[PDB]
């Protein structure tokens, strides 16, 4: 099982995730660092990790108040899933 650290540019500055892969199964995604806007961006991240793990897919909807945080997570995970 592969273990990649990915970083993409969020709304409040870069975010850093740990993505865990097993074949093409996304096993997990931990947040190592985010400094997004409390009660908005941090929430969008938790939500997007949930969507992606449940959906086993990065073709999922943004959290609508927070497209920039949402796309950061989508983009970070797209990077890890091309390996």
Residue numbers in the entry: 1 to 83
Give the exact sentences the study uses for this entry.
Herein, we describe the biochemical and structural characterization of two multi-FMN-containing covalent flavoproteins, SaFMN3 from Streptomyces azureus and CbFMN4 from Clostridiaceae bacterium. Based on their primary structure, these proteins were predicted to contain three and four covalently tethered FMN cofactors, respectively. Recently, Méheust et al. discovered by sequence analysis a multitude of sequences of extracytosolic proteins predicted to contain multiple covalently bound FMN molecules. The crystal structures were elucidated, which confirmed that the flavin cofactor is covalently attached to a threonine.
The asymmetric unit of the CbFMN4-D1 crystal contains two protein molecules. The CbFMN4-D1 structure consists, like SaFMN3-D2, of an anti-parallel sheet (residues 1–9, 14–22, and 25–33) and two α-helices (residues 38–56 and 67–83). Hydrogen bonds are observed between the N-terminal strands of the two molecules. The dimer interface appears to have resulted from crystal packing. Tyr11 stacks on one site of the isoalloxazine (analogous to Tyr14 in SaFMN3-D2), while Leu40 is situated on the other site (analogous to Ile45 in SaFMN3-D2). Additionally, mostly analogous hydrogen bonds are observed between the O2 of FMN and the backbone amides of Val68 and Ser69, the N3 with Ser69-Oγ1, the O4 with the backbone amide of Thr37, and N5 with the Oγ1 of Thr37, while the O4’ of the ribityl group has a hydrogen bond with the backbone amide of Thr67. Both CbFMN4-D1 molecules have a covalently bound FMN via Thr67. The structure of CbFMN4-D1 is similar to SaFMN3-D2 (their Cα r.m.s.d is 1.7 Å) while there is only 18% sequence identity. The highest similarity is observed in the FMN binding sequence motif. Structural elucidation of a domain of this flavoprotein revealed a similar overall structure and binding mode of the FMN cofactor.
